[PDB]
Amino acid sequence: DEDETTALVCDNGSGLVKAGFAGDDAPRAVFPSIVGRPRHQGVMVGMGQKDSYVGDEAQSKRGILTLKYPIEHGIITNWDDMEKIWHHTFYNELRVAPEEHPTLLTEAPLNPKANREKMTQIMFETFNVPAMYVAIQAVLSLYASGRTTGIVLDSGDGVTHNVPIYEGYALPHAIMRLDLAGRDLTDYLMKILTERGYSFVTTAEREIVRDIKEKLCYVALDFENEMATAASSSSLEKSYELPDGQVITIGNERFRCPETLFQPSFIGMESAGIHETTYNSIMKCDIDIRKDLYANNVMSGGTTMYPGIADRMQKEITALAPSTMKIKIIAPPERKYSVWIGGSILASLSTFQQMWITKQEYDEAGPSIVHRKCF
Amino acid sequence: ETTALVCDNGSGLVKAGFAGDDAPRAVFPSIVGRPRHQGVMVGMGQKDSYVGDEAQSKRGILTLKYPIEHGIITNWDDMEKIWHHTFYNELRVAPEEHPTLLTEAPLNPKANREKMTQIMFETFNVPAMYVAIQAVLSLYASGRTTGIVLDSGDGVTHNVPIYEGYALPHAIMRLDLAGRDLTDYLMKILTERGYSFVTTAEREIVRDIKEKLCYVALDFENEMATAASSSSLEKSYELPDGQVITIGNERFRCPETLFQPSFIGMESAGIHETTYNSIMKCDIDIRKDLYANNVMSGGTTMYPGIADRMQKEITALAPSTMKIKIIAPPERKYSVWIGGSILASLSTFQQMWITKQEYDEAGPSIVHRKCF
Amino acid sequence: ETTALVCDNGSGLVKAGFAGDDAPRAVFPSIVGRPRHQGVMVGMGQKDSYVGDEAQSKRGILTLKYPIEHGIITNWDDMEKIWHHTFYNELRVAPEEHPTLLTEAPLNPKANREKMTQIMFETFNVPAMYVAIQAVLSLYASGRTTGIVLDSGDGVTHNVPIYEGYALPHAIMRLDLAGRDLTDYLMKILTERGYSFVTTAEREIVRDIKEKLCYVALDFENEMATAASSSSLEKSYELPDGQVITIGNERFRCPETLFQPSFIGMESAGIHETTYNSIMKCDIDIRKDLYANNVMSGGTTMYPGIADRMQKEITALAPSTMKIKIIAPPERKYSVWIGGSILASLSTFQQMWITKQEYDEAGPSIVHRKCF
Amino acid sequence: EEEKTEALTSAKRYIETDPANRDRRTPITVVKQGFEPPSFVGWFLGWDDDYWSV
Amino acid sequence: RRVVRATEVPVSWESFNNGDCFILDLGNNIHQWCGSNSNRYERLKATQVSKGIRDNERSGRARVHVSEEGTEPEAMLQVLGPKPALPAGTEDTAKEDAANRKLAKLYKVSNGAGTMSVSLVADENPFAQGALKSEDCFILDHGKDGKIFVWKGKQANTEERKAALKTASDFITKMDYPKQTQVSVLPEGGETPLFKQFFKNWRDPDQTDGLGLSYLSSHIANVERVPFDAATLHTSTAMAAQHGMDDDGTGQKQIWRIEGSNKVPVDPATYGQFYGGDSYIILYNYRHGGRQGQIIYNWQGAQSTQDEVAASAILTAQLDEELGGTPVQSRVVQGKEPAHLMSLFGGKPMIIYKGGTSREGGQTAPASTRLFQ
Ligand SMILES: Nc1ncnc2c1ncn2[C@@H]1O[C@H](COP(=O)(O)OP(=O)(O)OP(=O)(O)O)[C@@H](O)[C@H]1O
Ligand SMILES: Nc1ncnc2c1ncn2[C@@H]1O[C@H](COP(=O)(O)OP(=O)(O)O)[C@@H](O)[C@H]1O
Ligand SMILES: Nc1ncnc2c1ncn2[C@@H]1O[C@H](COP(=O)(O)OP(=O)(O)O)[C@@H](O)[C@H]1O
Ligand SMILES: [Ca+2]
Ligand SMILES: [Ca+2]
Ligand SMILES: [Ca+2]
Ligand SMILES: [Ca+2]
Ligand SMILES: [Ca+2]
Ligand SMILES: [Ca+2]
Ligand SMILES: [Ca+2]
């Protein structure tokens, strides 16, 4: 079997932080990665008015706060807020000292290098972890499914990326990255709700629109027939309750919002949809391995959790591919947490202990050790 | 009590099995594959070197190298990997218990024979060993003791005259084009239809196209005229990613490089008149049965219509006062192994082995005085 | 008395002009731009498609398509738009009274060659036309007749050895790695510094960055160590929105895909191994002057230090007795057009013209017999 | 400049290693481009003064 | 759950459940079926065992298919039959990890003590790969489903091997194993991957440690820094000279000059009188008895422009091809002539004038005061 370990797995995505212990079946702490600061005048002295609120307590007080995401499209922008989120997840959620636990971190492909050196520098100097490693999210998503061969479309809140892997070997020249995910879908839904007269402008209103998107949107199998169905009748309209008690109704906006994933020209991007991104990722792989990559389409990330996205994905890839090939799409119900599950697998593997970046290697080599050890 | 092993080491296709069988137990290509990307899913069985048909399976993510080129072993460590894969993984036997029969190309250099002996006795520790020649085992499998053998495999084409069961070294002639060069020429002449095959991974695809859809035209010019006029010989092939290609006049143009080496810019002679040039170098008295015994061996003799075309081309330029017959058994792609399997299983072969102690007080030089 | 037209239609640029001149009159990129936004102001001058420099001047609101991808022509309606623009708008001449010389890369699919005929006599109705190999025109423009040409443009990179004014078909090599692939690789490696370029307009900007700020390192590892140890190799570029970017080692990593194709994931060898194997497939006596006459052509051979690097790599591969001369004229971006312009203006050339009469009695197959 | 210096040393070693013995103090004179003495120029068939100058 | 193992079960749909994973082996096709309630580790073990059965037992002559509920291929439904309702699956506890821990007994056979010895190495898997000593013969007994593996060392005696086979056959009737039990004989480096699952971290000898390195199939120059020795200059003065130009050059020759876009013959009183800014073609016939032959020289002046030298090359190639390809060419520039070309004029010097023809100016007038070197 595999040997026991005391490592920590911390999937620090653009929208959510999923932290827990290696070897467990589920992450212990899942909370949104926001930092809230008050924008009003405090007149009542006392009762512990903090200067900044982090995590779930920023969600509970989001009316009187402005909320900032330090991670924007995968790239950490505000390092102080990222250090604040890391201190909150080490000390207030897992309730552990980082000095005796190795830490596994996750990252999108094709980020800038300086993100990796600064993650190395704040993990080794501030928290004084004994070991560290950063891993590609799609590799962990393929670890969670139990397969070796497959192409992984991982779509989170900031980054949608396709990574193909044959046996254990990845193909870096075929990796595709598109900055089209749940942030852009939430902003597009915020735009198209103005057609019915509902105006959402602030950050807490953006969180409300994100909740509407999670609870009501779905992917249509064919767009134009569904537009004709929504125009002809009123059976597709559904209601939602705002937290002040107002009730809104939405119709075609249920399926116009995730269609931006398949038609990015709705927000002005000339790039192709995720089906063509997957197909052109398969075509840059050489001719011997297309057959296995067709039958092992793996979807992961929270943006892949719309109902009906697998059937539409099946129809579009079946249209693009030649007719003799069999196309199978793997959409497990636990695909929201599959990056963390693959991190929990990889940190507990017995082969992996000879690949931790230790403290003395960092001390002799600077923060540039991460590009020679990791990936 | 124990059973001998026969291992025919081809330049592109190695055959192995047990003596006393009517077919080789294992046929697999002699390639060594090495990875060209980084294995990021660690702990999931990545190897530094994939050997054999396994390397044929995951051929997209590998670079492939042939340890034997033009019939002669050049890279020796990869040949040890081929032999290790043959004994331990493929046949699943211990080499310490089984005697081993090997085959060599004609006009092999002596140092390769000694080095074959040295890695055979030191590295794998066989109890007995013997080396034989490709063409004489082909002639023994044909049931003859005198004849010309056209052995054309993947690396080279050999014309070997054998009289009274022994070869004639002054008339053995080597022509250096075979199915590798036919495959490369087919990659050349599929470019005008718009299909590109450049790396070593899809060379095997073009080899499969050459094996499934090729034939030797009896007459070339009328075949080209009917290919230009009609479309009755154009057929389709299904590439393993799903695209379908179609091939027309290239189906028969690609075997014609054997009869016309000028198609690839080679200034040598075609396969039909080099046998004539070999048989003119023999003595005048022995040509009567040497013309009558035209043994074809090797995998590139397996085209349809090559025997009738060879009959026509020999009959054209040999004199009319004699009869020419071409023999082509259906098992001619395994015939060297069949001759080795007959040879190893005889009741007079147990004294012809090179035992371990004879190598111990003789060194790697007894192979010349016994394999002769 | 009629002046012939020379129109070199490359993958990235179109070089058109009159025969007998020293420089091409019209040089413009072969793109077709189409609007992708919503037009709200009526009247004005909105067209359905923009061709050439007009598409470059308005590229912020257009999607740009190249008709030619890796040498072959994919879209023929767009290529007809390109030909109509270069006849009627750039050269401003009626093409029904001027013979037109066209150029073509070797080892092209045959179906283009009649199809290029199929527009030229049917839509534009030229009196005559001719198709010439680009490499022999580059060699003629240097004043040479025997030598090896490395022609590398925007789509393909091919090595052609030419002896006595005729290319040797058994040694021409093609490598699908040129300026568009280097542009895409530079878009890939500029994400390491945090710069995102995904739009086709941004692809044009990165192509401009590659033209201004890239060079071939003489040795790769020492230059990487120099770039790591200091910041003396860093240069700044100003984007058209006023943003200033800084590039360091990426100046020289992007030409190194020419010499190490494994950066973009290709098993095939570099341009110097391609030149060496192209020389090695020729006859033994003519290898002396092939090493000594090694001309370079195309826009992708315009980096600083490419000739010194090429001589360093060929010198390490060739025997030491050989003399190596890499020949890099300063006019090598337009050498194909200069060779075509001189070759079309000759008084002895007006019988190799494929006129209208033999075309419409012979059909679209005359180009396969008169243009060798 | 390292071309210049190690070419000076190579020219010296070319002087001592010749098979017919010559004078070891054969002088090495450095000539610049555009400033050449007539002793250098007189060995060239058809000198042009304005060849390199554009 | 932790100690995942494979057990052979009879081929029926009733043997299936929803909480484990299954491998259906049909020769050239291997189907991997994953249950809905199956966990991460037995999926990883199913993948590892399936790739082991492909790459080791069949040497890569197989294809591995991965399937789940509702996506069964036609092969599985053809072999197994129509699909019933699956009888769910128990949650993966720690008692069956202890059951998987007690499945195999590793025994030793060795004559190192001077006598027969069959002794128990271990009864607790995962075993150690280092426990398999190379000088002895070991036996693994997974005989509940009928498998007994006889692992032979490279340096084991023959009587140890025969004793190991005899002891493995004796294990059939003593412990009452069922009558299909296969005794698999395995040498070193040829192990079945059903044998490999009982060992902690099996290491093939050519495995990849870490991420690994690519081979790249192509290398750039890395020549060592040698100092150059100048004594090779004046020594080893090899020279090839001429190959067929043995005649002294009287011959019968024709000289053309290129003006604009056409060549004209020069005046026959003026052979060795060239212009520095023009380009010339010289056709020469051998009167010599060495199979006759023809030479075409292409002379290019230093002051000649690009159009003239390009037209000279093109007309040189055209003149070569319209004489049947028999002459051979020789490009020559001013100052670099061979000795045979200077001998064409018969003891005459080569006169080089200044100026020449052009497309826009024509023939230049000669100067009043002319100096010749
Ligand atoms: N039916 C067929 N038609 C055409 N070519 C074939 C056919 N079958 C096999 N070949 C070719 O024959 C070759 C293999 O034949 P064979 O095994 O006899 O040669 P070898 O022993 O590897 O070579 P050599 O004797 O030159 O060392 C390969 O090039 C293969 O493509
Ligand atoms: N049920 C759902 N339907 C559609 N989208 C969802 C659903 N649940 C979560 N999401 C989207 O997934 C995004 C984040 O998913 P995830 O990848 O788990 O986080 P991160 O991007 O931080 O790794 C959020 O922007 C959210 O909009
Ligand atoms: N100064 C330069 N440095 C590097 N590359 C250049 C330079 N000038 C042009 N190029 C490249 O040359 C390519 C076009 O070369 P050319 O052969 O003239 O056109 P075409 O390929 O269309 O025939 C362009 O892709 C461009 O990137
Ligand atoms: Ca994520
Ligand atoms: Ca053979
Ligand atoms: Ca070009
Ligand atoms: Ca279970
Ligand atoms: Ca022993
Ligand atoms: Ca002139
Ligand atoms: Ca000639």
From Swiss-Prot, chains B, C:
Modified residues (Tele-methylhistidine): 70
Presence of the UniProt keyword Calcium in the record: no
Major subcellular location class: cytoplasm
GO biological process: actin filament bundle assembly; actin filament polymerization; mesenchyme migration; positive regulation of gene expression; skeletal muscle fiber development; skeletal muscle thin filament assembly
Pfam families associated with the record: Actin
Localization in the cell: Cytoplasm, Cytoskeleton
CDD domains tied to this protein: ASKHA_NBD_actin
Location of N6-methyllysine modifications: 81
PROSITE patterns assigned: ACTINS_1 (PS00406), ACTINS_2 (PS00432), ACTINS_ACT_LIKE (PS01132)
Modification ADP-ribosylarginine occurs at: 174
Sites of N6-malonyllysine modification: 58
Region (Interaction with alpha-actinin): 107-120, 355-367
PTM section of the record: Oxidation of Met-41 and Met-44 by MICALs (MICAL1, MICAL2 or MICAL3) to form methionine sulfoxide promotes actin filament depolymerization. MICAL1 and MICAL2 produce the (R)-S-oxide form. The (R)-S-oxide form is reverted by MSRB1 and MSRB2, which promotes actin repolymerization.
Catalytic activity line of the entry: ATP + H2O = ADP + phosphate + H(+)
Methionine (R)-sulfoxide sites (modified residues): 41, 44
PANTHER family given in the database record: ACTIN (PTHR11937)
Role played: Actins are highly conserved proteins that are involved in various types of cell motility and are ubiquitously expressed in all eukaryotic cells.
Annotated family: Belongs to the actin family.
Protein name as it appears in the record: Actin, alpha skeletal muscle
From Swiss-Prot, chain D:
Domain of life of the native organism: Eukaryota
Tissue: Phagocytic cells, platelets, fibroblasts, nonmuscle cells, smooth and skeletal muscle cells.
Annotated Ca(2+) 8 binding sites: 3
Phosphothreonine carried by residues: 26
Associated disease: Amyloidosis, hereditary systemic 4, Finnish type: A form of hereditary systemic amyloidosis, a disorder characterized by amyloid deposition in multiple tissues resulting in a wide clinical spectrum. AMYLD4 is due to gelsolin amyloid deposition and is typically characterized by cranial neuropathy and lattice corneal dystrophy. Most patients have modest involvement of internal organs, but severe systemic disease can develop in some individuals causing peripheral polyneuropathy, amyloid cardiomyopathy, and nephrotic syndrome leading to renal failure.
Family assignment from sequence similarity: Belongs to the villin/gelsolin family.
Function comment: Calcium-regulated, actin-modulating protein that binds to the plus (or barbed) ends of actin monomers or filaments, preventing monomer exchange (end-blocking or capping). It can promote the assembly of monomers into filaments (nucleation) as well as sever filaments already formed. Plays a role in ciliogenesis.
Subunit structure, interactors included: Binds to actin and to fibronectin. Identified in a complex composed of ACTA1, COBL, GSN and TMSB4X. Interacts with the inactive form of EIF2AK2/PKR. Interacts with FLII.
Record's comment describing the protein's domains: Comprises six structurally related gelsolin-like (G1-G6) domains, that, in a calcium-free environment, are packed together to form a compact globular structure in which the putative actin-binding sequences are not sufficiently exposed to enable binding to occur. Binding calcium may release the connections that join the N- and C-terminal halves of gelsolin, enabling each half to bind actin relatively independently. G1 and G4 bind two Ca(2+) in a type I and in a type II manner. G2, G3, G5 and G6 bind only one Ca(2+) in a type II manner.
Protein name per the record: Gelsolin
Organism annotation: Homo sapiens
